[PDB]
Amino acid sequence: LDNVIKQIEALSVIVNRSEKADDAQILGPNTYKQLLEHLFS
Amino acid sequence: MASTTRLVNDRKQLEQQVKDDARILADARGLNITTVANDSATGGQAIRNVG
After folding, report:
1. CA–CA separation, A21 vs B37, rounded Å?
2. CA-to-CA distance for B23 and B17, rounded, in angstroms?
3. Other beta carbons less than 10 A from residue B12's beta carbon
4. Strand, coil or helix: B20
5. Residues of chain A with C-beta less than 8 angstroms from the C-beta of B49
6. Are A25 and B49 in contact (CB under 8 A)?
7. In terms of CA atoms, which chain B residue is nearest residue A19?
8. Distance between CA B41 and CA B19 in Å, rounded?
9. Is B29 on the interface with A (CB under 8 A)?
């Protein structure tokens, strides 16, 4: 029974926000994971 | 047109001579070199390939 009106944002603001982050140019170090084995003889 | 017409040139020669022999007798101190660091980078806008 209650609604809140949302003020719209300008086109330039949306365009600027879209380019802020979330880009696949820079990588990072990583290592392999180990899986359980449980070997015996 | 006599020896009085050479005072300025004599003074020029004297300036040069005194500067020369005052530099000759000066003792030099070897200054230590500091302020050597990589603080001359460059900026700009990223290219950020789109896709």
Report:
1. 32
2. 10
3. 10
4. helix
5. 25
6. yes
7. B48
8. 42
9. no
How many beta-carbon contacts under 8 Å exist across A and B? 4
Which among B18, B37, B34 has a CA at the least distance from the CA of B26? B18
Length of chain A: 41
Q: Which residues of B touch A25 (CB under 8 A)?
A: 48-49
**Distance of alpha carbon A11 from alpha carbon A18, whole angstroms:** 11
Torsion of CA B17, B21, B26, B31, to 10 degrees: 50
User: How large is the C-alpha radius of gyration of chain A?
Assistant: 24
Instruction: Give Cα separations from B26 to B17, B23, B29, B30 (angstroms).
Output: 14, 5, 10, 13
**What's at A20, amino acid-wise?**
K
Q: Give the experimental resolution in Å.
A: 3.7
The encoded tokens of residue A19 equal 């380019």
Interface residue B45 vs chain A (CB under 8 A): no
